[PDB]
Amino acid sequence: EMEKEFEQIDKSGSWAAIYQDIRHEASDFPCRVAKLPKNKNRNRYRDVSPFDHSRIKLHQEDNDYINASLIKMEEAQRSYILTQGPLPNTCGHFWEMVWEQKSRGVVMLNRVMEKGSLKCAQYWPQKEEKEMIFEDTNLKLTLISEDIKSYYTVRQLELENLTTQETREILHFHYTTWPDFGVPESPASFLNFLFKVRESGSLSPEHGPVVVHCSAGIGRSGTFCLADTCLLLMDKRKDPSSVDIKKVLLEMRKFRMGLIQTADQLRFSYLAVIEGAKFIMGDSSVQDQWKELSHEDL
Numbered sequence: 001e002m003e004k005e006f007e008q009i010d011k012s013g014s015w016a017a018i019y020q021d022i023r024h025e026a027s028d029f030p031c032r033v034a035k036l037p038k039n040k041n042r043n044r045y046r047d048v049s050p051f052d053h054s055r056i057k058l059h060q061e062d063n064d065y066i067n068a069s070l071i072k073m074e075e076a077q078r079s080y081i082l083t084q085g086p087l088p089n090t091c092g093h094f095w096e097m098v099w100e101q102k103s104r105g106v107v108m109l110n111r112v113m114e115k116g117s118l119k120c121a122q123y124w125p126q127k128e129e130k131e132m133i134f135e136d137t138n139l140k141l142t143l144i145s146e147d148i149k150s151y152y153t154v155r156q157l158e159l160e161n162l163t164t165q166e167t168r169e170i171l172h173f174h175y176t177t178w179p180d181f182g183v184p185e186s187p188a189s190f191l192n193f194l195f196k197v198r199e200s201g202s203l204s205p206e207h208g209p210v211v212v213h214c215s216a217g218i219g220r221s222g223t224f225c226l227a228d229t230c231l232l233l234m235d236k237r238k239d240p241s242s243v244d245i246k247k248v249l250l251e252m253r254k255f256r257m258g259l260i261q262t263a264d265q266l267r268f269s270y271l272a273v274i275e276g277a278k279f280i281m282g283d284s285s286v287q288d289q290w291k292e293l294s295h296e297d298l
């Protein structure tokens with residue numbers, strides 16, 4: 001039990017310090033490409049960059065940069081692409097990357113407007129009849145349906161490569177109630193949503209890595225990937241005792257900087273893992289209780 005560890009860290013009020021040690025221990029690799037001057041206007045934040053070694057390269061000879069990273073969790077045998085919320089000029093790049101990388105699911109953890117600021121471009125069509133064409137990457141996107149729920153929406157989209165005319169279905173999971181630099185309202189609303197993503201098949205190895213983003217692709221994206229991988233590792237071994245959360249977070253930060261932005265987000269990660277563990281160890285009925293506690297209807 002990371003449970004014991006959780007009570008001791010709480011009991012002695014020391015998340016700030018435990019989170020600070022992750023920060024000082026975390027990895028540091030270069031981001032030369034992200035920092036090229038031709039890429040300035042492809043980055044949302046000056047100080048949030050993909051390492052060169054783990055960046056996703058677009059397949060066009062023009063300029064292959066995008067602010068995204070392949071988090072390849074070897075032992076857990078899942079991968080995720082974490083990326084900033086796209087920008088008015090980089091939405092073509094975004095869906096280029098989804099196409100080239102054979103992603104089936106995009107997980108969006110932020111709202112387009114937060115705290116009065118435009119934190120993400122409006123990169124998917126809000127109405128079936130108003131589809132989008134990205135001239136630059138020669139792709140078309142169209143909203144097929146949506147299922148709107150109290151704190152999250154699930155869209156089904158169709159992505160077409162206009163060159164070849166092949167079409168794919170992309171599922172879009174939008175958590176709408178998670179403040180920037182914040183935590184979800186409970187472990188339950190969080191897990192209910194993670195489980196809906198899992199249940200979609202989007203995270204299968206038959207598919208490319210799921211794309212996860214928030215505004216910068218590190219705080220909230222961090223939090224969600226970390227819990228998913230920890231659950232998964234615990235699931236693989238059917239052994240809570242042997243998942244070390246901080247060390248998994250450190251493994252993740254080898255592929256992208258800054259994953260998990262606050263001590264509270266770290267603490268929440270733990271709660272979410274501890275809570276999810278129940279389902280993974282065979283109490284199936286905990287899933288239904290999360291649907292209830294989360295209040296996904298009205």
Ligand SMILES: O=C(O)C(=O)Nc1ccc(C[C@@H](c2nc3ccccc3o2)S(=O)(=O)Nc2ccc(F)cc2)cc1
Nearest residue numbers: 047048110180181214215216217218219220257258261
């Ligand atoms: O959508 C999200 O959930 C999200 O993750 N958002 C988000 C993340 C990071 C930042 C920027 C900050 C930052 N950028 C870093 C890059 C790597 C790791 C952490 C980072 O935090 S900062 O650099 O501007 N602040 C700072 C830098 C240095 C200091 F000494 C104090 C303070 C802004 C929004």
